[PDB]
Structure 1
């Protein structure tokens, strides 16, 4: 157990870079080439990638496909992640019907709401809206890893606290508020994205 696993930030950088090389059609890449694309010392790259042994190598370079597969494996890309969605409104339902994430390994196995007129209706094929009163019990019983928050800002922090109390490991947050929890959070906010976009549009003017 001597050659060390590369640290997370490195692995993620390799992974995204290898992903580009794959889209480009590159089968073999050298450490020197990785050094230039990643702005990272070639000796470090070789040290890192030696973790994968001869399997990682093809010819005078590295097997782009082998490394993409192996690093993805370490990063949980081959894991089937279990999600729940809280909020069965516009956004929640859209996420429940977003089929392509299912291809990629993200499985929504429950969706919850507090509205009696929503509970019991189908949010998506094979997915029935459950009473949010059951959220903690369900997240614990099914070992749910990711909670998607799709409720209005007013109840987002409360929902987030219930999820982490129930053992959620990460949260994807669509509510227009910054949630404060111990677990990692990724936010999606179409308005924030639009503000970034429009700043860049205006910035082009000289």
Structure 2
């Protein structure tokens, strides 16, 4: 659990992106109202969210403060487990590196892939991962393996001292309560497309 509610926490990266978009179009200031319009959050909720962290808005300053709030002024040592399609897609997303997420190694069970170069890292045998985590002070494990007996792999990361798991698998991983588990569900985005495709009808029906 967290000092600030997850509901607020989950809005923070969206404010951050949107302020990045304004800072990059040289927009100097933004009102509570334009900001609320764009975010679909009430102006007063946005005030409240930001009030957790100190005292319209100067774009560059709010941006910089959100960068700080989000921990993006620090470095995280990451590894990726699973060098398949998803693992390589994530590995090649160099924008995460510019935000402080330093990819230190990538691990697979498939000898076909051992030695493959992605950016500056070589795919290594997952056999050595627990050693690697402790040798390299790894903070985050990104999990992109198939789901079968995945708990076992999770357990190996946890007992090697990982601090957080960014999990793409569609199961419930069990981790101790001190370990951060963030589960990705791309369906949550996809299902808003089906919603919007059918919303007009849906309402025809209800009335």
> Which band: TM-score by shorter chain?
0.7 to 0.9
The one of 8, 21, 43 aligned to 1:23:
21
Instruction: Mark the structure with the bigger radius of gyration.
Output: 1
For residues 199 and 47 of structure 2, the distance between their equivalents in structure 1, rounded to whole angstroms, comes to 39
Q: Return 79-88 or 98-107, whichever deviates more.
A: 98-107
Q: Within 5 Å, which residues of 2 pair with 1:116-195?
A: 116-119=111-114, 121-182=115-176, 183-190=179-186, 193-195=189-191
Tell me, yes or no, if the aligned pair for 1:31 and 1:45 is still in contact at 8 Å: no
Q: Return 61-70 or 13-22, whichever deviates more.
A: 13-22
Q: Return 193-202 or 145-154, whichever deviates more.
A: 193-202
Aligned length: 191
Task: Report the Cα offset of residue 14 of structure 1.
Answer: 6.2
Matched, 1:83 2:103: no
Task: Report the Cα offset of residue 113 of structure 1.
Answer: 1.3
Q: Which runs of 5+ in 1 are unaligned?
A: 1-5, 53-60
Tell me, yes or no, if the aligned pair for 2:32 and 2:43 is still in contact at 8 Å: no
Tell me, yes or no, if the aligned pair for 2:83 and 2:144 is still in contact at 8 Å: yes
Question: Which residue is 2:62 aligned to?
Answer: 67
Task: Report the Cα offset of residue 77 of structure 1.
Answer: 1.0
If the length of structure 1 is used for normalisation, what is the TM-score? 0.72
For residues 79 and 66 of structure 1, the distance between their equivalents in structure 2, rounded to whole angstroms, comes to 18
Tell me, yes or no, if the aligned pair for 2:19 and 2:63 is still in contact at 8 Å: no
Change (3 A) 1:161 1:63: same
